[PDB]
Amino acid sequence: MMELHILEHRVRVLSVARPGLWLYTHPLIKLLFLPRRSRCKFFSLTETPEDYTLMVDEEGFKELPPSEFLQVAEATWLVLNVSSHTKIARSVIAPLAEHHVSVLMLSTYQTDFILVREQDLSVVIHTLAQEFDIYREVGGEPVPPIQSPQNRFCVLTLDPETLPAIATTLIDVLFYSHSSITFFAFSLIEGYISIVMDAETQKKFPSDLLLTLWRMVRIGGQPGIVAQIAGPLAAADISAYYISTFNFDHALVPEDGIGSVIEVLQRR
Amino acid sequence: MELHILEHRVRVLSVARPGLWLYTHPLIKLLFLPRRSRCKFFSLTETPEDYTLMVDEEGFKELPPSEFLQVAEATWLVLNVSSTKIARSVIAPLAEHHVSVLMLSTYQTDFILVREQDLSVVIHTLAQEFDIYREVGGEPVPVTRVHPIQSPQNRFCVLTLDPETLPAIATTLIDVLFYSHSSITFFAFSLIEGYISIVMDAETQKKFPSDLLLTSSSGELWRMVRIGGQPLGIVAQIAGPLAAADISAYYISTFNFDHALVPEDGIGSVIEVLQRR
Numbered sequence: 001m002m003e004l005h006i007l008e009h010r011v012r013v014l015s016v017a018r019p020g021l022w023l024y025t026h027p028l029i030k031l032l033f034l035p036r037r038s039r040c041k042f043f044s045l046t047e048t049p050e051d052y053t054l055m056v057d058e059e060g061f062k063e064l065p066p067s068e069f070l071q072v073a074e075a076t077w078l079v080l081n082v083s084s085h086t087k088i089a090r091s092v093i094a095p096l097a098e099h100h101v102s103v104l105m106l107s108t109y110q111t112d113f114i115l116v117r118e119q120d121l122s123v124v125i126h127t128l129a130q131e132f133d134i135y136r137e138v139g140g141e142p143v144p145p146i147q148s149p150q151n152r153f154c155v156l157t158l159d160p161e162t163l164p165a166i167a168t169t170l171i172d173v174l175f176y177s178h179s180s181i182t183f184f185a186f187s188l189i190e191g192y193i194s195i196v197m198d199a200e201t202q203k204k205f206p207s208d209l210l211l212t213l214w215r216m217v218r219i220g221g222q223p224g225i226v227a228q229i230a231g232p233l234a235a236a237d238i239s240a241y242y243i244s245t246f247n248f249d250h251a252l253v254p255e256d257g258i259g260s261v262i263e264v265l266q267r268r
Numbered sequence: 269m270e271l272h273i274l275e276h277r278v279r280v281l282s283v284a285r286p287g288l289w290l291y292t293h294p295l296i297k298l299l300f301l302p303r304r305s306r307c308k309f310f311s312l313t314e315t316p317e318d319y320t321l322m323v324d325e326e327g328f329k330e331l332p333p334s335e336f337l338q339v340a341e342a343t344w345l346v347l348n349v350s351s352t353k354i355a356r357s358v359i360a361p362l363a364e365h366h367v368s369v370l371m372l373s374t375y376q377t378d379f380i381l382v383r384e385q386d387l388s389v390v391i392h393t394l395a396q397e398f399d400i401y402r403e404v405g406g407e408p409v410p411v412t413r414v415h416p417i418q419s420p421q422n423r424f425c426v427l428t429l430d431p432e433t434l435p436a437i438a439t440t441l442i443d444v445l446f447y448s449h450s451s452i453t454f455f456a457f458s459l460i461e462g463y464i465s466i467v468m469d470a471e472t473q474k475k476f477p478s479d480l481l482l483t484s485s486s487g488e489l490w491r492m493v494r495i496g497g498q499p500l501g502i503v504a505q506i507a508g509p510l511a512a513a514d515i516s517a518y519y520i521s522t523f524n525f526d527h528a529l530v531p532e533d534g535i536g537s538v539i540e541v542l543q544r545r
Contacts (some may be wrong), residue, residue: 025296026289030447033439037447164439168300175293176304 002084004092004132005142009042011115012061013073013104014054015246020069021052025175027063031056032188033167035160038063042079044106046245047174047184053245055106055115073246077104078121080114082132086239088112089230095127097227105226105242105249108187108194109157112242146219146248148262149179151198153252155241156210158193169205173197183216183250185243196243196252214241215258217265220248232268233261270350271358271398272408276309276460278344278381279328280370280500282523283319287336292446294330298323299457300438302431305330309346311372311458313522314445320522322372322381322458338523340500344370345387347380349398352516354378355507361393362386363504371503371519371526374458374465375428375484378519415495415502417542420452422469423489424529426518427481429464440476454492454527456520467520467529490518491535493528493542502526509545510538 016024031043040060046053055077056064064070082088092114096103101123104115116124125134135142158166173184185196195210202210219225226242226249233240233251238261241252253261283291298310307327313320322344323331331337349358352373358380359369367389370381382390391400391411401408429437444455456467466481470489473481495506503519506528510517515538518529530538 022293023290025293026446029292029442034443034447037443165436167439167442168435171296172301176297176301 002082002091002132003135004128005081005083005135005137006121007079007081007137009079010058010118011042011055011077011079012058013075013077013246014056014064015071016052016054017069018051020067021175023067023069024064028054028174029171030063031060032170032186033163035191042189044187044189045174045185046243047182048245048248049182050245050247053247055104071246075117075119077115078118080116080124081111082114086112087234087237088114089234089237091131092128093227093230094234095131096124097224097231099123099127100224102224103226104244105230106187106244107241108189108192109155110192110194113189115244145266148215148217148258149181151179151181151183151216152255153183153196153198153214153216154202154210154212155214155252156195156197156202156212158195158209158211160191160193162209163193165209166205173201173204181216181218196241213255214252215255217251217253217258217261218248219265220245222247225249228268229265232264235264236260269398271394271400272348272350273387273400273402273411274346274348275403275406276346277325277384278309278322278346279325279339280342280344280381280523281321281323281331281337281339282499283321284336284338285318287334288319288446290334290336291331294332295445296442297330298327299441299459300434302459302462308462309460311460312445312456313520314453314455315522315525316452317522317524322370338499340523342383342385344381345384346372347382347390348377352378352518353511353514354380355511357397358394359504359507360511362390363508365389365393367393369503370521371507372458373518373520373529374460374463375426376460376463376465379460381521415497415505417539418452418494418496419535419539420450420454420492420494422451422454422471422492423532424454424492425468425470425473425481425483425486425489426529427466427468427473427483429466429481431459431462431464433480434464436480437476444472444475452492452494467518489532490529491532491538493530493535493538494525496525499524505545506542509541513537513541
């Protein structure tokens, strides 16, 4: 009935250490603000107290030199999106984890992306052929146990042609700003802009540009958990935004029920 | 008729093009974030040879070593005449006393950079025609103690800009400076004491938003004369000749060449005077 689409993007996952981020000001800026200079179509940038986790297609990957501040996940990743015409947890990540496949969840303002190794593509088609109808984009056509800080997050989108109006204030946040977690998310994917940022980080930005109450739960290890969270929250389903970084996995649920989401996440 | 010595202590260096990316992070801070730098004198000039950077000591502390970097060993002071014919009354005599100078004409004022080594001589040479002041505690205090010419055909514009609208052009400006690629490629941006001066091409002027860059009655645009040379190791031979014709010009010195910008409809009359000498 429903549909699960596999998209063209060939994503690479990087971890740029914080003290090294500046060595990549030139590349990342090209990917952030200058559409007409990089053919990249999938750009995800996340800031966490451990590092800056990046996800970029192969075309946006040839512009990031290797270095000591930069550790790359040696796997290539494909993108999955559910459509019809968020019950995603129990229908995508529980069958996935049951066969011990790891998934990187990246929910955005527009859609939710499930990232999988390409070596594990053979299983997602078989463990799932009968829950959805699986499509694959050929061209532009579809052919068949840890912490939570007190930060209050906003998930905002942005008209692409207004990105310059914030460029500076955005650059300032990422390359020059050094509970109470520092967390930031910016993703330009297929020309769609999504950002997660706390409340007084939005105070930095002008008033009415950021077009549109959340809160963070968090857990993961260095270098399966996303399924634990996803299944613990699908039980008595609530809304959530899942973002996977190099080390941790994050979920953003509304404030009004944060406590409940910590009761279900801790018993499991 | 006043001569002011400003408190700026400027360093002058050259960034080779292959390495400009390595300085995107510091440069951007100096260009767009006037709070995370105590620098208040900043100038960046793109020529075909290299990028030239004139930056005070605070902004100089923001730049890391590199093989693409060539820093002039000397510290420089900035001179300014108060109430662009600085030639016949400053550059000419100082040149007669064998004092090299680095010009930096901006939309707001014309800066004359001299090494502190030469400072004394400068006073010795100009105390008779100007009352020389020095900026102590932010206050102007009276002090008692063989070269061919290149004439590109680009049409340059001299623009200033309201600082409170600089972000609106940021993405464009960055694109022009860090990610781009008879004529020559020449681009000037300077922020000094909160004033922005940009020299641009008209082909480069199309890429920017509308109704932000401000020009001085420029229906007539500008043309460049450019006398070449090697690294920091000659404006007298452009300023003084050009002084005879009482014609005004924007002077800009870079690490390897010297540039004068004259109104366009007189460019020929300028080149004439320049090849006599």
